Design a binder for this molecule. Structure first.
Ligand SMILES: Nc1ncnc2c1ncn2[C@@H]1O[C@H](COP(=O)(O)OP(=O)(O)CP(=O)(O)O)[C@@H](O)[C@H]1O
Ligand SMILES: Nc1ncnc2c1ncn2[C@@H]1O[C@H](COP(=O)(O)OP(=O)(O)CP(=O)(O)O)[C@@H](O)[C@H]1O
Ligand SMILES: [Mg+2]
Ligand SMILES: [Mg+2]
Ligand SMILES: [Mg+2]
Ligand SMILES: [Mg+2]
Lengths: 282, 280
């Protein structure tokens, strides 16, 4: 791996901790302005039985995070140990864990329950994150609650860029393209046409919305993955989550339009959610 | 998905159970001669978040097992639910878990004798010999991919990466990119080829795991720097519970030059000999 000083972090200053392959760890001086300050962070590294592809994915994930730039709703890359030793990708620690676990643990006893506003606010932040990503020519391809992290201050953060790509780094029409994308969050064009665009992420955003309003429920319950695409082609779509407004449901439905261009853009989603969120506050 | 009556099993006769994605299950009449007897089996199916590649792998696995044929040291394929519903690959239930856990469980849960270890190795060589005779390359040989029945019978499993020796994209950069690096033959990566001799390299690693009682290969060496070391001649040291002879066999399996490694046929002959001596 090439040397990249701006991001390199001294191995001797990193104390690997318990597992979260990801593990918690302490990094001394990772924050330039606090040279002696130890910071709690997360570290992703290869497993002992990792494959060559696992490595290329880890490297790819790290580089995308470098080119993306910093944003409020995207997990932050803090540094990396890429020389004379195993590859370590150091990223910001999200104390509340992944969004799916977060929501399930806050389900009504039937922790601190989620208010309707919290759910709308969560969706809004994530829409902003995706809006930014798209402006950076980046397609995540793996959007899902399990891939969202929440910070101690409940800030939503898009994560796991293990499958993300530059808009131009997709091999259109090849049978092997998009073969490693979870089917239940995947846009029909991804497999049918073997393409991938920001609008493909919008479809994924929709399922994420459903996951959010079902408080961490599994999409297409009872429907096996090998039967899904037949049903989608036939017009099947998940049902309205309970306690979800028809308006938010229509938003989900709009994300699930078969024609990519008929789906809203992340910018449109952001403006709409912003309105719904503001009007709920008032 | 095509209909294969021969292997198709009725879903209504299958009752899924606890997790072992693989789950335990009870199958009624899976044994044709005993139409009313429920058999405890193991079922492999897709996870809710499975990918397209996860599906073709499962299909490939099922199809390979069909082609392979039956052998005492190969997890037996019992049937499959492929129509109108999720794909279920029903295989023989191995009550004692995978070899890696088995071995670590009985670390000085009844301690393994040198003979047991040799026997374990012998059985696996036999399975791989047959596998090889059927023109099949496993590609993912490892203790974690060996199951052990109630009678301590060794069984090679997880054919999720197995292929027909003739179905390999020779020299393509994307070839063999999903094989655990630490069990991988050097040529598998440097030249993008895979042959039976590539499997014997992995067998060598499997042997080291066995005699170390489930030890982790290349301890302390990250996968990132393993191939450079391998290219330089680095090889694992002899396991303490191992005889020099058996270690030499491992070294043989790890010869740089593929054609210079023994064949599974030769391994079985040598192992049988050693086993016959050890038991006498
Ligand atoms: N920065 C972080 N802070 C807190 N928890 C984190 C974290 N990074 C990862 N985790 C935890 O680890 C889980 C898996 O992380 P990630 O999605 O990056 O996994 P992964 O890329 O290794 C494998 P897969 O593709 O199977 O998820 C997260 O859902 C979360 O629970
Ligand atoms: N027939 C069987 N009987 C008993 N246990 C079984 C079994 N098949 C699988 N298992 C258990 O499940 C584990 C995983 O099995 P397998 O290796 O087939 O997994 P897999 O292909 O689903 C995933 P991976 O490729 O990550 O291992 C085994 O190591 C064993 O503990
Ligand atoms: Mg993930
Ligand atoms: Mg990942
Ligand atoms: Mg396995
Ligand atoms: Mg497998």
């Amino acid at each position: 791996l090439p040397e990249d000083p701006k991001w390199e972090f001294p191995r001797d200053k990193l104390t690997l901790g318990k597992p979260l392959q990801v593990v918690m760890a302490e990094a001394v001086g990772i924050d330039k302005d606090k040279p002696k300050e130890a910071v709690t962070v997360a570290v992703k590294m290869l497993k002992d039985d990792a494959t060559e592809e696992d490595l290329s994915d880890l490297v790819s994930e790290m580089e995308m995070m470098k080119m993306i730039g910093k944003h409020k709703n995207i997990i932050n890359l803090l540094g990396a140990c890429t020389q004379d030793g195993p590859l370590y990708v150091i990223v910001e620690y999200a104390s509340k864990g992944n969004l799916r676990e977060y929501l399930r643990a806050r389900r009504p006893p039937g922790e601190e329950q989620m208010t309707f506003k919290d759910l709308v606010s969560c969706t809004y932040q994530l829409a902003r994150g995706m809006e930014y990503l798209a402006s950076q020519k980046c397609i995540h391809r793996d959007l899902a609650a399990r891939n969202v992290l929440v910070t101690e201050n409940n800030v939503m953060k898009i994560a796991d860029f293990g499958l993300a790509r530059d808009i131009n780094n997709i091999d259109y029409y090849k049978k092997t393209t998009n073969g490693r994308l979870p089917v239940k969050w995947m846009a029909p064009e991804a497999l049918f046409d073997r393409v991938y665009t920001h609008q493909s992420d919008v479809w994924s955003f929709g399922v994420l919305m459903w996951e959010i309003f079902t408080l961490g429920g599994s999409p297409y319950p009872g429907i096996p993955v090998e039967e899904l695409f037949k049903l989608l082609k036939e017009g099947h779509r998940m049902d309205k989550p309970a306690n979800c407004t028809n308006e938010l449901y229509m938003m989900m439905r709009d994300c699930w339009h078969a024609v990519p261009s008929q789906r809203p853009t992340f910018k449109q989603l952001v403006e709409d959610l912003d309105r719904i969120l503001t009007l709920t506050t008032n």
